[PDB]
Every structure is written in C-alpha cells, then in structure tokens.
Amino acid sequence: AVGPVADLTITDAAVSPDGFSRQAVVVNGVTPGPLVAGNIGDRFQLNVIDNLTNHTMLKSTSIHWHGFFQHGTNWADGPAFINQCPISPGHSFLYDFQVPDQAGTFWYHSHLSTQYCDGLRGPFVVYDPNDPHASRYDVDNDDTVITLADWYHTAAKLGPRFPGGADATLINGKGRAPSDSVAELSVIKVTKGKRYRFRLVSLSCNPNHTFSIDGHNLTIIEVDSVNSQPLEVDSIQIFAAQRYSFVLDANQAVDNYWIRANPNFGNVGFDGGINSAILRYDGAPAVEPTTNQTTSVKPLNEVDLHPLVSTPVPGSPSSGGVDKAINMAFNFNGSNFFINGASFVPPTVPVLLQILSGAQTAQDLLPSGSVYVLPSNASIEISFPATAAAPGAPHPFHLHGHTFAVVRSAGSTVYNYDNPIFRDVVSTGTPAAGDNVTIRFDTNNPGPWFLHCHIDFHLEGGFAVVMAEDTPDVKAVNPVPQAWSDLCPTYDALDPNDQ
Numbered sequence: 001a002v003g004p005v006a007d008l009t010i011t012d013a014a015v016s017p018d019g020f021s022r023q024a025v026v027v028n029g030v031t032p033g034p035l036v037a038g039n040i041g042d043r044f045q046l047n048v049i050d051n052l053t054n055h056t057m058l059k060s061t062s063i064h065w066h067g068f069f070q071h072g073t074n075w076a077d078g079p080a081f082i083n084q085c086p087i088s089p090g091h092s093f094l095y096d097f098q099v100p101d102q103a104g105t106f107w108y109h110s111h112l113s114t115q116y117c118d119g120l121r122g123p124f125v126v127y128d129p130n131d132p133h134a135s136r137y138d139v140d141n142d143d144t145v146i147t148l149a150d151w152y153h154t155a156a157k158l159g160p161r162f163p164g165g166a167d168a169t170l171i172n173g174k175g176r177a178p179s180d181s182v183a184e185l186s187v188i189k190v191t192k193g194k195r196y197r198f199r200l201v202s203l204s205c206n207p208n209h210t211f212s213i214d215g216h217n218l219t220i221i222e223v224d225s226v227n228s229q230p231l232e233v234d235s236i237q238i239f240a241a242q243r244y245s246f247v248l249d250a251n252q253a254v255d256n257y258w259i260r261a262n263p264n265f266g267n268v269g270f271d272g273g274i275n276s277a278i279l280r281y282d283g284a285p286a287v288e289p290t291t292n293q294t295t296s297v298k299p300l301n302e303v304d305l306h307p308l309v310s311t312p313v314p315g316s317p318s319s320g321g322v323d324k325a326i327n328m329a330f331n332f333n334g335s336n337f338f339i340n341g342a343s344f345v346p347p348t349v350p351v352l353l354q355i356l357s358g359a360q361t362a363q364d365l366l367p368s369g370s371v372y373v374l375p376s377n378a379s380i381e382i383s384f385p386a387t388a389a390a391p392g393a394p395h396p397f398h399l400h401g402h403t404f405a406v407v408r409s410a411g412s413t414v415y416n417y418d419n420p421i422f423r424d425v426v427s428t429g430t431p432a433a434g435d436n437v438t439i440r441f442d443t444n445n446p447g448p449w450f451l452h453c454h455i456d457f458h459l460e461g462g463f464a465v466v467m468a469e470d471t472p473d474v475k476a477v478n479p480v481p482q483a484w485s486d487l488c489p490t491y492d493a494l495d496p497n498d499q
C-alpha cells in the first residue's frame with residue numbers, strides 16, 4: 001500500500017487483465033490502481049500527477065476519495081465542475097485532507113466524465129488500531145482487499161452510450177472474457193485455521209455483482225465504512241461503489257474453491273471460469289477449483305444490517321419528521337437522465353468556485369434547477385421513488401460528504417426509524433417492487449456535495465444533483481490552497497483536444 005503521503009502518477013498504458021490487450025488509464029502503472037492506506041486520524045497528501053497523453057480517455061483528470069467527509073476540505077472532494085476544475089495534463093495537484101473520524105473500506109476514482117471506467121480506480125483503506133471488530137479475525141492486509149471491477153474491451157467514449165454489460169468481471173484485477181477461458185485468474189491465498197478480514201470493494205462502473213465463495217459463509221462486519229453488527233450470509237449482492245468487510249474462517253479442507261462475482265447483466269454465470277477467482281488454502285495444488293455452487297439460503301438483505309453501535313436516525317420517528325424533505329422524481333429520454341426535470345450538465349465555473357465568488361442561493365447557482373440549498377444543522381430526508389421512467393434500474397445512488405441512514409431499503413415496504421444501517425451508496429431498487437428508498441442525514445458539513453447515480457454512464461447522462469450545504473459558511477470553513485485556485489485557469493486554457 002501507498003499513502004498516506006504519496007505520489008499517484010496517472011498515465012495511459014496497455015493492459016490485458018483478461019488476456020485482451022487495450023489502452024487504459026492506469027495509476028502508478030497499474031489498474032486497478034494501488035491500495036492507498038492510512039489510519040484514522042491521518043492527514044493524507046496525495047500528489048496526483050497527470051501524465052496522460054490520450055484524449056479519447058481524457059488527458060485531464062480529477063480524483064474523488066469515495067466515502068470521506070472532507071470536512072473543511074470540500075475543495076479536495078474531486079467531482080469535476082462541482083468541487084474543482086480538472087487537473088490538466090502535465091500538471092500535478094495535491095489533495096490534502098484529514099480523516100479524523102472515520103475508518104473502514106473506501107476507494108478512489110476519477111470523477112471526470114466516465115474516465116474511471118477506463119481504469120482510474122483503486123481501493124483505499126483506513127485502519128482503526130482500536131477496531132471494535134478486531135477480536136473476529138487474525139489477518140487484515142493488502143492481500144485481504146478484494147476488488148470487483150467491470151472491464152470493457154471498447155473504451156468508454158467509443159462504445160455504446162449505455163453498454164449492455166462488461167466483457168469480463170475482474171476480481172483483484174484479473175478475470176476471463178467468455179471467449180478466452182485460458183486467461184489467468186486471481187488467486188486469494190488463505191491458510192487453514194486463520195480468520196481473514198476480507199474488504200470487498202466494488203469499483204464497478206455499472207453492473208452490480210452477487211458475490212459468493214464455494215464452501216464458506218461470510219460474516220459481514222462493515223458496510224460502506226460503518227461498523228455493523230455481525231451478519232452471516234452466504235452471498236452478497238453488492239452495488240457499484242459499495243464496500244463490505246466480511247470475515248472468512250479458513251476452517252474448511254485445504255483445497256481450491258471458486259470465488260464467484262456474477263454480474264446482474266452482461267456475461268452471466270461461470271462457464272469457462274468467467275466471473276470467478278480462486279480461494280486457494282496453502283498446500284492446495286495450483287489448479288482451478290472443481291467445487292460447485294450451492295443455493296444461497298442466507299443472502300444479504302440490507303434491512304438485516306444494523307450499526308454495531310447505536311446511532312440515532314436524524315429527525316423524528318415519522319414520515320418527514322425532519323427539517324427538510326426532498327423527493328427525487330426520475331426521468332429518462334433515451335440519451336439523458338433527469339432529476340426533478342433537470343438533467344445535470346456541469347457548469348463552467350465549479351459550484352464551489354461559484355460559492356466562493358458569492359453565489360449562495362439556488363437562484364444564483366448554476367446549473368439552474370440542479371442545485372438544492374440546505375440549511376445548516378438540519379435534518380434532511382431524501383426519497384428516490386423507483387419508476388419505469390428511469391430504465392437501468394436498480395440505480396445505486398451516492399451522496400458525497402455524508403454517511404446517511406437508510407430508513408427505507410429496496411425490496412422492503414417498511415420504514416426503520418430505530419436501528420437502520422448507515423452507509424453512503426444505496427440501491428434505489430425497482431419499480432417492480434414499488435420501491436421508495438429513503439435516506440436521512442444531518443447537514444453539519446458545509447459545502448457543495450454531489451448526489452448521483454453511481455452507474456457512471458448514468459451520471460454522464462445527467463443523473464445527478466448538487467446539495468449545497470450551509471452556503472454562507474462554505475468560504476470560512478473550506479479555505480482553499482493556491483494550487484486549487486490555479487486549476488480552472490489552467491484547464492480553461494487547454495486546447496479542447498488536450499482536455
């Protein structure tokens with residue numbers, strides 16, 4: 001792992017994770033990029049060096065540190081034209097922030113167009129030397145991070161606007177496309193008798209994945225950086241951008257066992273060993289498993305998750321017992337997504353720069369109809385009713401700068417004002433189940449924070465809004481470095497083909 005103080009060099013390279021060679025966006029030579037790690041309390045100084053040369057995958061870039069509150073450092077959050085102008089090619093920029101009050105499993109990714117889909121994405125872990133779950137496992141390290149990624153043989157800007165699924169699911173950066181079932185698979189080495197904290201991170205641009213391990217159950221103890229009550233399951237459906245820690249007891253027979261991550265669409269199942277990797281106990285031969293999959297009889301259900309430590313829900317025990325309730329009505333017209341009649345188009349001047357330049361009201365802020373001004377020190381409820389009007393369901397919505405209470409989960413008609421799980425990416429379910437997924441949070445974090453579908457192609461088609469939280473305090477609370485002030489002039493000076 002690198003960090004907390006590190007250079008991250010962004011370049012274009014040839015990679016072949018599934019044996020097919022293509023140009024991708026890589027981080028210190030690799031994709032998924034390297035694990036960034038620190039401890040709770042750390043200051044991170046992550047120097048992002050943009051040495052990109054390929055305009056099709058974008059020569060400019062911007063990195064988001066997914067799940068971090070970034071309190072007082074809203075300028076470092078990453079979304080292009082919300083929190084900064086992109087870094088320009090040939091330049092570097094220092095993201096410099098603290099993580100005083102969080103620990104768990106995160107990730108980092110480009111937040112410029114669909115560039116993370118082209119490879120700029122990797123895992124990010126913040127350890128707790130007082131982790132309340134430490135008694136449950138023996139091993140937690142670089143090799144117990146498990147990444148899932150959808151991989152495409154055509155680049156983001158070159159294929160369909162809304163791809164019908166990936167060529168290959170990669171697990172720790174390797175996997176098979178169904179045409180070449182010879183390509184090397186990832187191996188996750190375990191040792192009989194040891195308990196492992198596996199940190200499962202979905203780096204997905206689009207599909208969700210139903211993750212299982214032949215012969216083993218999984219005890220979930222963390223959900224998107226929030227410590228849970230331990231929950232034993234035999235399969236986990238994990239949506240783009242979500243994270244779970246699970247404990248795996250390596251107390252079965254020394255052998256090879258299939259690791260399975262079946263996407264919701266694209267190449268499904270496991271023929272040829274697609275959608276798979278290998279759990280190899282030490283001593284087992286260097287061969288593919290021959291285990292078979294059994295029916296999941298205890299699948300994860302989000303409603304079954306609860307915080308480890310009692311965490312009151314923001315507001316009061318009633319539908320709309322909050323200071324401000326916002327409903328998000330979805331639409332789609334074949335090319336673009338809309339929220340409450342507005343398809344997001346990034347503004348010329350980043351929302352944060354507009355605020356620092358005096359714009360504190362929805363009337364003054366751009367894009368018009370896409371920015372919701374929130375009062376300070378208030379409870380907020382947001383509902384995302386599933387509708388046939390928004391194909392590509394279930395949409396995993398993400399709120400930057402906050403961890404929220406999921407008061408109503410997909411596939412559940414029930415509202416939990418008592419002990420609902422908190423997380424930062426939530427499936428908004430389907431119109432088939434009449435879902436009306438609802439979240440709550442408190443506005444104690446001044447700044448503009450993106451709220452958007454985490455299917456990158458949908459974000460790109462406009463499926464986003466901005467929550468402009470406590471705009472009158474943004475300037476005082478988030479002092480900006482000169483390097484940040486320099487971004488927009490430099491970017492705006494670029495030829496459009498060097499963007």
Ligand SMILES: *[C@@H]1O[C@H](CO)[C@@H](O[C@@H]2O[C@H](CO)[C@@H](O[C@@H]3O[C@H](CO[C@H]4O[C@H](CO)[C@@H](O)[C@H](O[C@H]5O[C@H](CO)[C@@H](O)[C@H](O)[C@@H]5O)[C@@H]4O)[C@@H](O)[C@H](O[C@H]4O[C@H](CO)[C@@H](O)[C@H](O)[C@@H]4O)[C@@H]3O)[C@H](O)[C@H]2NC(C)=O)[C@H](O)[C@H]1NC(C)=O
Pocket residue numbers: 014015020021022023024054055056057153154155158
């Ligand atoms: C900027 O980044 C973008 C996004 O990735 C790059 O876009 C690529 O554009 C090229 C050229 O326009 C496209 O090439 C097409 O590629 C396909 C598939 O190619 C792959 O499969 C081959 C078959 O086995 C194999 O030879 C290739 O290997 C080479 O390429 C890789 C990757 O760079 C390299 O690592 C290797 O060393 C090899 O050099 C590769 O694995 C190919 O089939 C296409 O050909 C049909 O296409 C044309 C028109 O129909 C025709 O002339 C041919 O007869 C052929 O039948 C074509 O060459 C490519 O698909 C794009 N990549 C992606 C992921 O979308 C762009 O290249 C980058 N620019 C720079 C400067 O690198």
Ligand SMILES: *[C@@H]1O[C@H](CO)[C@@H](O[C@@H]2O[C@H](CO)[C@@H](O[C@@H]3O[C@H](CO)[C@@H](O)[C@H](O[C@H]4O[C@H](CO)[C@@H](O)[C@H](O)[C@@H]4O)[C@@H]3O)[C@H](O)[C@H]2NC(C)=O)[C@H](O)[C@H]1NC(C)=O
Pocket residue numbers: 215216217234252297298
């Ligand atoms: C992961 O979780 C799943 C679900 O919780 C769990 O599956 C359960 O496994 C047990 C294995 O103990 C299954 O029950 C067995 O079923 C067989 C077939 O009917 C019976 O013959 C077994 O009886 C023998 O073994 C018992 C000990 O448990 C003796 O008490 C008994 O007298 C017999 O000798 C036994 O009942 C159970 O049905 C499943 N439940 C399902 C599928 O819902 C699985 O074991 C867990 N995996 C791991 C590795 O922990």
Ligand SMILES: *[C@@H]1O[C@H](CO)[C@@H](O[C@@H]2O[C@H](CO)[C@@H](O)[C@H](O)[C@H]2NC(C)=O)[C@H](O)[C@H]1NC(C)=O
Pocket residue numbers: 319325326327383385386436
């Ligand atoms: C999903 O829940 C939201 C939030 O409760 C609902 O929107 C509210 O509906 C009632 C109408 O009976 C209004 O009084 C509230 O003011 C609404 N909030 C709005 C529109 O901002 C929504 O109706 C529910 N939708 C579905 C499909 O169940």
Ligand SMILES: *[C@@H]1O[C@H](CO)[C@@H](O)[C@H](O)[C@H]1NC(C)=O
Pocket residue numbers: 333334335336343
């Ligand atoms: C969908 O709406 C967008 C944004 O308003 C518009 O520019 C686009 O042309 C529309 N597309 C179709 C297919 O109607």
Ligand SMILES: [Cu+2]
Pocket residue numbers: 064066109241398454
């Ligand atoms: Cu994200």
Ligand SMILES: [Cu+2]
Pocket residue numbers: 064065066067068398399400401
């Ligand atoms: Cu985020």
Ligand SMILES: [Cu+2]
Pocket residue numbers: 392394395396453454455458459463
């Ligand atoms: Cu979506």
Ligand SMILES: [Cu+2]
Pocket residue numbers: 064079111398400450452
């Ligand atoms: Cu985001």
